């Protein structure tokens, strides 16, 4: 029994396993906004849009 336990003990005497986890976040945002106000104002003939 002592020997069997010793063999298992040998298996157990294992270093805790560390892992380095590198998860990377990549965010890309591309933005285009165009607004056009087209304006014709004349008050002489009262024409204005």
């Amino acid at each position: 029994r002592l020997d069997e336990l010793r063999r298992i003990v040998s298996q157990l005497d294992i270093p805790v396993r560390q892992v380095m986890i590198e998860a990377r976040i990549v965010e890309a945002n591309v933005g285009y906004d165009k607004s056009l106000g087209v304006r014709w104002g004349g008050a002489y003939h009262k024409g204005n849009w």
């Binding site: 104002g41 008050a43 009262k46």
Partner: peptide, 26 residues
């Protein structure tokens, strides 16, 4: 008077180059 872009020139006849310009800005 209109409605969609309401207009009734008599009411502001009570009130041309200045009044209509603004009124008609729309």
């Amino acid at each position: 008077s209109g409605y969609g872009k309401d207009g009734n020139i008599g009411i502001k006849d009570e009130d041309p180059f200045v009044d209509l310009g603004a009124k008609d800005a729309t």
